[PDB]
């Protein structure tokens, strides 16, 4: 239905908006681009599923996210990746970890204040119908 198409369009608009607000925050600049594969060759095989906010925006546009649940799974992945790759006690790693927990916490906070639970539920019930 056109009504279902319209619902998924509203979700994409919503997710693009959350993602943009993350990507323009100076704290989250490191998470806006893939890890350059030369600058860092070991990334690839330490991190099984790389993920960044640019990839998130491409996945939105390719209609990969049918629920906010699915989108927050990728944000959790950016955070978990950052914590796993940068575990050390040194200030370099600790700043990334702090920033990666802040990205996570900010995304969940935006969604908690701005996503209608009835919109998320609709999205889940359409998704379940596929
Ligand atoms: C910080 N971590 C390594 S992370 O939390 O695991 C991570 C990182 C990234 N993305 C980046 O680090 C982007 N990035 C590069 O790979 N190289 C850049 C671009 C070229 C200029 C430059 C100069 C200095 C340092 C880096 C770079 C850059 O911005 C994405 C996700 C995660 Cl989880």
UniProtKB/Swiss-Prot annotation:
Highly expressed in estrogen receptor positive breast tumors and in osteosarcoma tumors. It comes from the Eukaryota. It is found in: Nucleus. Residues 108-130 form a coiled coil. Residues 3-114 form the Bromo domain. Induction: Up-regulated in breast, uterus, colon, ovary, and stomach tumors. Induced in breast cancer cells overexpressing NCOA3 or treated with estrogen. Down-regulated in 5-fluorouracil-resistant derivatives of the colon cancer cell line HCT 116. Belongs to the AAA ATPase family. May be a transcriptional coactivator of the nuclear receptor ESR1 required to induce the expression of a subset of estradiol target genes, such as CCND1, MYC and E2F1. May play a role in the recruitment or occupancy of CREBBP at some ESR1 target gene promoters. May be required for histone hyperacetylation. Involved in the estrogen-induced cell proliferation and cell cycle progression of breast cancer cells. Interacts with ESR1 and NCOA3 and these interactions are enhanced by estradiol. Interacts with acetylated lysine residues on histone H1.4, H2A, H2B and H3 (in vitro). This is ATPase family AAA domain-containing protein 2. It comes from Homo sapiens (Human). The chain holds residues 981 to 1108 of 1390 of the full protein.
